[PDB]
Amino acid sequence: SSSFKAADLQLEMTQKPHKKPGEPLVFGKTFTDHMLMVEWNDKGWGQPRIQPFQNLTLHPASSSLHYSLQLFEGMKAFKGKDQQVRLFRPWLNMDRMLRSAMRLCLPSFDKLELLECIRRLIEVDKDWVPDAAGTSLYVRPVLIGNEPSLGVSQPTRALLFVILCPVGAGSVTPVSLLADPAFIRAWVGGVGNYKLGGNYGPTVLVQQEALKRGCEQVLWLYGPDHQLTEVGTMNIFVYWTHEDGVLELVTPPLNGVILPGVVRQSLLDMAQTWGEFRVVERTITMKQLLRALEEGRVREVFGSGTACQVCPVHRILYKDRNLHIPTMENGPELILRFQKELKEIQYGIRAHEWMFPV
Amino acid sequence: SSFKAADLQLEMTQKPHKKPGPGEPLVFGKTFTDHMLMVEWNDKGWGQPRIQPFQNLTLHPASSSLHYSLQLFEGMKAFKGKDQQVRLFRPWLNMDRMLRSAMRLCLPSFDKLELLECIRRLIEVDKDWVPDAAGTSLYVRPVLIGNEPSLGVSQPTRALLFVILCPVGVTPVSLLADPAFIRAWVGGVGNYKLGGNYGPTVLVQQEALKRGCEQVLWLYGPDHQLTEVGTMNIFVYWTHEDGVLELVTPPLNGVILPGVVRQSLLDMAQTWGEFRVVERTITMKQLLRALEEGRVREVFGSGTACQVCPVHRILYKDRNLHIPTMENGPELILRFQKELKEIQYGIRAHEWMFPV
Ligand SMILES: N#Cc1cnn2c(=O)cc(Cc3ccccc3)[nH]c12
Ligand SMILES: N#Cc1cnn2c(=O)cc(Cc3ccccc3)[nH]c12
Ligand SMILES: *Cc1c(COP(=O)(O)O)cnc(C)c1O
Ligand SMILES: *Cc1c(COP(=O)(O)O)cnc(C)c1O
Ligand SMILES: [Cl-]
Ligand SMILES: [Cl-]
Ligand SMILES: [Cl-]
Ligand SMILES: [Cl-]
């Protein structure tokens, strides 16, 4: 397996630049002037290219639409005061993208070439990256199969493309969650730990049920012991005093039903570095949370992920009865600290190797 | 709201493609006919259905069909009888299944009989692509996809329904049975025909090939239940532990795709009334024991593409189990094939066939 090369980039600037949006942006609805595109076939990878944001033209038998040979990434770029733009830990997104590619028998590529191409693309649309407090550029790489045939097999054609959305988003607002064991997001030996499109379509109906029932997100439970796995599209963390009397930050381990989040890892890294309390990757059950809540040992429950960064939870609707989560009562101190450090790093206030300059 | 066949627009092709040569083999799903059906949906409701030349789709880069697998499909066959009459096999069931799939993915509802008529109209237009050599047919592939130009994970406000056709052209297969592989789970979506269920199986199928097997026998649960064979339902014909001769296939408890061929085989066998016909869990342990006790007669997969597919070998981890399907006729398999053929090619008129 060869790889496309960033040296071979082909650039084509738009003939009529689009009018940028300070006003209300909906997430993922406004895109920039350009996009990256690379084609793969039996002759390997073609030359990458930046081109005006434009429609895909696909054979109607394309395996991307019949058998979900499709995977994506999500990461952010932040514009610092000094008008410099930085990507947050992009190497980890490239790492995960490649593992996802392998799981779906899609073509391998060089993580650094893709990153260089993405850098080049963001450079070209530098000015779309906003700089108002708490804003960023969302980067959405995608790799889809494109075999024009109905056989369920390893494709001999593929498209890799990348589009960009400017986004907005410090009054951290807590959410309520529906926790219903009938809905299972992922299973051991499945593909829940890869960022494949097939993992997301089925959750749309589940999220609608959570809205009809007065909740804002889904808390995905797993196992007959009802383990807390994820919140919506976010990893979940619990800050509590554990059954053994020790203050800790816990998140479920990567046993196959958890998507390894970049924010998740970064929160673990940060907490470990501070050395101020126990940081552990351990299974969390509803039984354990209820008991900890009845003994007042829970301080904060929250989600982590690129879009929200850190999202507090204040209520869980479980077994038809509502559980209050005292997250906001506790500051939320941990949440606020995490947000501030990430913000200082992301907007270049503290220099840090996690940031990748555009 | 629904599209109506009465409103169909027809655009005939100006560039007809050459039909498959007489000395050229039809590889499954690579050759398409000249026309396709196309129906779009948005906040205004369903647009007009069109039969139009086979052509590429134009998709926004953010299309939810490509990021969050808002996609489902179907698979059914049209058969040309000696009288040159083309007929669809139990299409109402595919239409039923397609709508359930759509509901599961918050994709727009449509009228089943309206789509069936549009599909009939489409096949009528391309009727000369329907082959007539024995064991040949026309594969019909309806597809419904969300098409929201937005990265939000939510109910799409636009969708695209299309149908394409492929002309398509009892030798036993070996199966890899390894509990490491899971196709579906209770509380998942294995019982719907959604694109997301198939992509993850490509690597597993490569693993079966590497290990010298032709298909994957999908196992589920601590007790290693036999669920499906590749993209087919699985059936076992044996003398059960209570000494009774039966045809068993797994029940529809969430991890099984309700196949049309499967339902048809249950219906036929129930009608005969010559042996016990049941839907029940089947475990590797039950199979292993029945094999050493010489109780297994035939094991086979069922599905639209193969109809009935015999199994001769199962590689369970490292044990190679011989399945005596072919040493037993295979009597039931042949019987099913013979009866299906009579119904499908119009030899014997039947309510299961829908005339085109
Ligand atoms: N973080 C976060 C978050 C909360 N809602 N939300 C959304 O509703 C959508 C996204 C984008 C996304 C991220 C990962 C997988 C699929 C889609 N992110 C988020
Ligand atoms: N029957 C059958 C059979 C055996 N192999 N096979 C294939 O390799 C492909 C198909 C078409 C199909 C059917 C259902 C889901 C996805 C694809 N069918 C079959
Ligand atoms: C993308 C994703 C996350 C979080 O990922 P980040 O890399 O932190 O943005 C968590 N859970 C699921 C299910 C996801 O798809
Ligand atoms: C389509 C399908 C079947 C069988 O379907 P028929 O309706 O009989 O063609 C069985 N299993 C799986 C996994 C399928 O996708
Ligand atoms: Cl990093
Ligand atoms: Cl992992
Ligand atoms: Cl019927
Ligand atoms: Cl069912």
Swiss-Prot record, chain B:
GO terms for biological process: branched-chain amino acid biosynthetic process; cellular response to leukemia inhibitory factor; isoleucine catabolic process; L-leucine biosynthetic process; L-valine biosynthetic process; lipid metabolic process; regulation of hormone levels. It holds the Pfam family Aminotran_4. PROSITE patterns: AA_TRANSFER_CLASS_4. The keyword Mitochondrion applies. Its EC number is 2.6.1.42. The modification N6-acetyllysine is found at residue 285. Its main location: mitochondrion. It is found in: Mitochondrion. Changing residue 228 to K: In HVLI; reduced catalytic activity. The keyword Glycosyltransferase does not apply. GO terms for molecular function: branched-chain-amino-acid transaminase activity; L-isoleucine-2-oxoglutarate transaminase activity; L-leucine-2-oxoglutarate transaminase activity; L-valine-2-oxoglutarate transaminase activity. CDD domains: BCAT_beta_family. InterPro entries: Aminotrans_IV, Aminotrans_IV_CS, Aminotransferase-like, B_amino_transII, BCAT-like_C, BCAT-like_N, BCAT_family. Ubiquitous. Keywords: Acetylation, Amino-acid biosynthesis, Aminotransferase, Branched-chain amino acid biosynthesis, Disease variant, Lipid metabolism, Mitochondrion, Pyridoxal phosphate, Transferase, Transit peptide. Catalyzes the first reaction in the catabolism of the essential branched chain amino acids leucine, isoleucine, and valine. May also function as a transporter of branched chain alpha-keto acids. This is Branched-chain-amino-acid aminotransferase, mitochondrial.
